[PDB]
Design a protein around this nucleic acid. Structure first.
Lengths: 42, 149, 148, 104, 153, 68, 187, 85, 70
RNA sequence: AUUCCGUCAACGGACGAGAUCCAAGCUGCCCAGUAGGUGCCGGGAUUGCAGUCCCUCCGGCGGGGAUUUUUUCCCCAACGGUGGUCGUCAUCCUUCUUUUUACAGGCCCCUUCUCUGCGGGAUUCCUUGCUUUUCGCGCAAGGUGAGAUUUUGGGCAACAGCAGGUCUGUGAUGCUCCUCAAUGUUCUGGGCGACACGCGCACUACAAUGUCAGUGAGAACAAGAGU
RNA sequence: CGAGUAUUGCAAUUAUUGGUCGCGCAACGAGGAAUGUCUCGUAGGCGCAGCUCAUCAAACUGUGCCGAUUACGUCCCUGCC
């Protein structure tokens, strides 16, 4: 189902990575891993 | 000393203890049931009509070992996998009415006890009787050695 | 505190091999057995692994072997990997008990004989089941190339 | 004395920062009546994120994965509460959650 | 297996109660027969009448047949339950039925035309010739290739 | 039957272009009509194996050079 | 005390009934096969596995649905048992022999140039032979039991049965022959 | 088959005479064949085409609880037999 | 390629060059040596250096190996 | 291996390649515990009597018998030790008790498997094998060897390059459109999911190698209570 | 696929999903010319995490359980320096 997410970075349903209370676009997520602490695992 | 339920093959033993509940006419089916689906997973269901005894045998098998085994555990020991169709090859469903029956019945049989009113753990008597049974079956085999040692 | 016909003394080892882990105890008292899942091994009945683990005693004679009890308990699939684990622990049990409860020449022979027919007392079958390859979602292979 | 099992639990965004934390407080608290049974560390929890990258439209629809493991250190003390509170006067950094609990 | 030498119990292949019954069978699917649709083994009804592998379909005793014929049409008279009952709310009896035979055919025609008749996409989708889902519906129809084809020109 | 048993004595190396063949020097065990041994033949094998190993030589005097 | 085959056969009271093949085959006397052990990627390693282990893998695969190495060994023990009661032979005295017969000693080599397919005489390696042999024996066995329930319990036994005879009546010996014939054909 | 397809590019297999049935010859034959081989297996019964290795094997068990053939593994399923002495 | 990289070879060399003589032909102490006479980064690299240091000495031990002296 | 030797109109440098880093396998603590790890800690019994227990089975020293009488065999004493007919290198029960509310051994207790932090460790180190060059940078096989190969899987990764793709993120946006009788926005309702067909992946079946009924003391890895 | 019950959702009515019992012999007996990937506790099978997620994956990204030919070369083919 695709109309209730409204990306909190971006208002978006599309482009937003749905993961763990986050609501950022895929790009936005790619931008953010450092301040958060995610480093490549694979 | 010897061989208890911890030491004995139900392949002879449940097949006999099943009979301990049969042969003796102690508990059998509940009013609500006697037809038996395998469980939500299958129609084809118990070729052995003794399933409920077998069940009881097995719920009993559980209860001494995993003292305090709740309702939800019985669903899990129930197991199985499902070929749904042109679809996944994934694990199956355990029918609880009868599960709950089995629980009701072995405690009425006083082989099960509702430990802490919950998860079942054995009656003392059960397991002495089990060990007793174990010995009786054990010795006379249709295999190799020792009815003639 | 027990005392078993006035007993004296234990040692403990584990076996893991792949996911699977078994833990083992060696100790002495007043006759001969060695027990699996609560009961003597000449008497324990999964043939499957049992028959896999005995052979040094069983082909040749058990007197060199069934010299002590080892009481053993299990958790681990890797069912086999568990078997190989058990033996390894067993081997470990033998020697540790022996360093203390015998001397070298028997400790060394026991080991030697063991190593000589060893199923991996000191090694790992290092994995079981591999980190995927994402993209393909696999281990070496690959979503088809559909070419064109 | 009437000890308190104090659990000071330290979970941290890296193992790094927290060990520094852990140690120093304990050193500080200890000296002397603070009495501790050695630090046990509960499972490092891991957070995984794989993303569909690229807006290939055309070109490879290939995807990339960032992770954050989160490290848990626990030390228990059978110690005085006021003393605990006396030493507990550290403002401490971030990336290191430190919880202190008094069960028994 | 037995050491029985018998030819009249090696039996076959008989059409009874407007069904077919083959020889052999662990016993079940001989009893399963007649379709159009569920006709009415229930597995259970027949298994409940006292039939088994100990006769197979192949043993083919007349006695048995009579007993089946008897159990099947009042299944829950035999307490053989009603909670399954291939039909359970008709709509003209509004009820229950262990439906049998050609009356299921009859039932099929009547109900399918009306069910189909008041129309809607969903309705037509099972009706004209589709699997009643699959999103991408054309792909289904695989090698039956000709769902039916339609033009009003 | 002509087993003539010659021991692969040397693995000479891999020729061909499939990685499949290997040229091998074989030293006969006994060769019918001569002092046993000390009769050398080169046969060319198929993979799996090594020197020292025992081929049951079928076309025995037919020694093999080029695998092209 | 050289281990005895399933409890019930001595091997050191058997030997390889071949004049050349004999070495390569590994053949430690046993009671059971398979265990862990990386041979694979180097030509040498393959050797240490004795004959029966190769058998232990060898009976099956399925598009999806296999891995069951486990099985193969129990049934096989049973076919061999029967075979012993069938031929009176020790299954070592059956396999060794079967091997000794089913193993082709010359085969034809493809030496292709630019896609053109020529072939030459290549003399089959004793190792290659073992490889071949095993592969062969089971292939035929597998052949019958298969499709319309010719029964793996019936077929395998029947194959090896024919292999120690070296019977024509075995897809194995059919191929073994074909290949020696075919190499002699190629030239 | 009733199936229109259900058969490949090369594979071909012919019929057996083994069945569910009860037959004078079968039963009687079974009595005379179950001694006959030195090793008796359910499979050989199947192979002598009268009754398959399945229920024929039961024929063997129910001749071997009559001792006619000697049940070898010390258990069931992949038991086998030899003719009795 | 069990080619001792340039950096490596240079280093294994260099340590005898600045830190004359001593050592072993044993890797083990030469290893410890690698740790001890440099302030290097990865272990591997020290060990590798070491392996060669053992090596270079081992043939220095039998000569003033091509390009090398004391 | 753009890895090195070496040769050598370069010489010298640089970033790539090395290399690094995460993850990976071995680790009597070499790191510190567990009141979410493992252990003698309780109190009481030992399940076809042919067994725990005993010892010609053997042998030394012997005797009888049989015997091809040669340590030929049987029986047999003492001795010793094997041997002996299932089991007591110890097996079981009862869990000891017992809990003001779903708990019901013991514990002086004992650190060892347990998380996870420190930190090891391989070097083609060595042997042997290519006497290569005279020297060689190297290379194989074998060894120690948990662990031998640019050890493991990754991660990282040069430089140009590709109007790819990128208006389907973008609160990056040219130029270029509508802006409300807009294609804004909401709302509603629909659609993209419609089946002659042509494909691309996948998935499943076709099956005894199986299917069915039941029975098996099989753990990964990893989730979850927002303001 | 047919009544039949439970659940999602404001809404399923382009059947949300389950459930149930009947119920099938569709195709489909393993697939041509072609053809896709792949050389270690691993192929590969086999299964399970984890999220998309109101509700729903054969996807996604992992986890496991089980468990192997010869290749180890060759440089042909087909391709890169």
């Amino acid at each position: 189902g695709k109309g209730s997410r409204h990306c909190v970075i971006c208002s978006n349903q599309k482009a937003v990575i749905r993961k763990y209370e986050l609501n950022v676009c895929r790009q936005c997520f790619r931008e953010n891993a450092a301040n958060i602490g995610f480093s490549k695992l694979r | 000393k010897g061989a208890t339920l911890r030491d004995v093959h139900p392949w002879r033993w449940v097949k006999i203890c099943s009979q301990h509940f049969k042969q003796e006419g102690k508990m059998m089916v509940p009013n609500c049931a006697e037809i038996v689906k395998t469980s939500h997973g299958r129609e084809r269901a118990p070729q052995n009509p003794d399933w409920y005894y077998i069940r009881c045998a097995a719920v009993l098998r559980a209860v001494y070992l995993r003292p305090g085994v709740g309702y939800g555990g019985l669903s899990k020991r129930f197991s199985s996998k499902k070929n749904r169709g042109s679809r996944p090859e994934i694990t199956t469903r355990a029918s609880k009415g009868l599960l709950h029956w089995c629980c009701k019945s072995l405690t009425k049989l006083e082989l099960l006890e509702k430990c802490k009113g919950a998860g079942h753990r054995v009656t003392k008597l059960g397991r002495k009787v089990a060990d007793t049974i174990a010995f009786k079956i054990a010795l006379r085999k249709m295999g190799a050695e020792t009815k003639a040692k | 505190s027990g005392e078993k016909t006035h007993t004296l003394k234990q040692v403990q080892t584990f076996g893991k091999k792949k996911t699977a882990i078994a833990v083992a105890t060696v100790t002495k008292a007043p006759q001969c057995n060695i027990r699996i899942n609560g009961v003597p091994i000449s008497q324990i009945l999964p043939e499957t692994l049992r028959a896999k683990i005995m052979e040094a005693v069983k082909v040749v004679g058990a007197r060199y072997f069934s010299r002590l009890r080892v009481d053993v308990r299990v958790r681990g699939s890797g069912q086999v990997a568990q078997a190989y684990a058990v033996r390894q622990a067993i081997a470990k049990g033998i020697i540790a008990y022996y360093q203390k409860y015998h001397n070298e020449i028997e400790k060394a022979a026991l080991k030697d004989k063991y190593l000589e027919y060893d199923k991996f007392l000191l090694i790992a079958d290092p994995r079981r089941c591999e980190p995927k390859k994402w993209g393909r979602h696999s281990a070496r292979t690959r979503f088809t190339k559909s070419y064109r | 004395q009437e000890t308190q099992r104090v659990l000071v639990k330290m979970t941290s965004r890296n193992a790094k920062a927290v060990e520094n934390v852990m140690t120093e407080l304990l050193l500080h608290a200890r000296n002397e009546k603070v009495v501790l049974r050695g630090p046990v560390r509960l499972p490092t929890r891991t957070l995984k994120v794989t993303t569909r990258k690229t807006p290939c439209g055309n070109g490879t629809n290939t995807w990339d994965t960032y992770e954050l493991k989160i490290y848990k250190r626990l030390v228990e003390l059978r110690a005085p509460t006021e003393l605990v509170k006396k030493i507990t006067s550290f403002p401490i950094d971030a990336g290191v959650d430190v919880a202190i609990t008094i069960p028994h | 297996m037995s050491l029985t030498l018998q030819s009249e119990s090696f039996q076959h292949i008989v059409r009874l109660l407007n069904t077919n019954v083959e020889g052999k069978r662990k016993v079940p699917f001989a009893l399963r027969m007649v379709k159009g649709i569920g006709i009415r083994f229930a597995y259970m009804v027949c298994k409940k009448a006292g039939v088994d592998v100990e006769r197979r379909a192949g043993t083919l005793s007349p006695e048995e047949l009579e007993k089946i014929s008897e159990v099947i049409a009042d299944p829950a008279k035999f307490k053989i339950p009603e909670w399954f009952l291939n039909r359970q709310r008709d709509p003209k009896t509004g009820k229950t039925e262990h439906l049998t035979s050609s009356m299921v055919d009859t039932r099929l025609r009547e109900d399918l035309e009306r069910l189909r008749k008041i129309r809607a996409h969903r309705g037509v989708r099972h009706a004209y010739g589709l699997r009643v889902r699959g999103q991408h519906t054309c792909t289904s129809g695989r090698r039956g290739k000709t769902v039916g084809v339609s033009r009003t020109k | 039957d002509q087993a003539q048993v010659g021991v692969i004595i040397k693995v000479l190396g891999r020729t061909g272009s499939r990685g499949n063949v290997t040229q091998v020097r074989v030293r006969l065990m006994a060769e019918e009509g001569s002092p046993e041994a000390n009769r050398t033949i080169v046969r060319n094998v198929k993979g799996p194996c090594k020197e020292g190993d025992m081929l049951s030589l079928m076309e025995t005097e037919r020694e093999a050079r080029r695998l092209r | 005390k050289a281990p005895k085959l399933f409890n019930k056969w001595s091997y050191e009271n058997l030997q390889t009934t071949e004049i050349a093949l004999n070495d390569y085959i590994t053949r430690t006397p046993t009671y059971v096969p398979h265990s862990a052990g990386r041979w694979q990627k180097k030509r040498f390693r393959k050797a240490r596995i004795p004959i029966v282990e190769r058998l232990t893998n060898g009976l099956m695969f399925k598009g999806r649905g296999n891995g069951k190495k486990l099985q193969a060994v129990r049934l096989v023990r049973h076919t061999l048992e029967i075979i012993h009661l069938l031929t009176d032979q020790n299954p070592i005295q059956v396999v060794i022999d079967a091997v000794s017969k089913g193993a082709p000693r010359e085969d034809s080599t493809r030496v292709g140039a630019g896609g053109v397919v020529r072939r030459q005489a290549v003399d089959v390696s004793p190792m290659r032979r073992v490889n071949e042999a095993i592969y062969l024996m089971c292939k035929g066995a597998r052949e019958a039991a298969f499709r319309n329930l010719k029964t793996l319990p019936e077929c395998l036994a029947d194959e090896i049965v024919n292999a120690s005879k070296g019977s024509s009546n075995s897809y194995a010996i059919k191929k073994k022959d074909e290949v020696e014939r075919v190499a002699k054909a190629n030239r | 088959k009733k199936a229109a397809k259900k058969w490949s590019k090369g594979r071909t297999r012919e019929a057996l005479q083994n069945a569910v049935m009860f037959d004078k010859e079968t039963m009687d034959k079974l009595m005379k064949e179950v001694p006959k081989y030195k090793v008796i297996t359910p499979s050989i019964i199947s192979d002598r085409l009268k009754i398959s290795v399945a229920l024929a094997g039961k024929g063997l068990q129910h001749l071997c609880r009559q001792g006619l053939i000697r049940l070898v593994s010390c258990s069931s399923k992949f038991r086998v037999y030899t003719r009795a002495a | 390629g069990k080619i001792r990289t340039k950096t490596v070879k240079r280093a294994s060399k260099q340590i005898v060059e600045k830190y004359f003589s001593k050592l072993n032909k044993d890797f083990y102490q030469n290893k410890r040596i690698v740790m001890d006479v440099t302030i290097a980064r990865s272990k591997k690299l020290k060990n590798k250096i070491a392996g060669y240091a053992t090596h270079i000495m081992k043939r220095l031990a039998r000569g003033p190996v091509r390009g090398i002296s004391l």
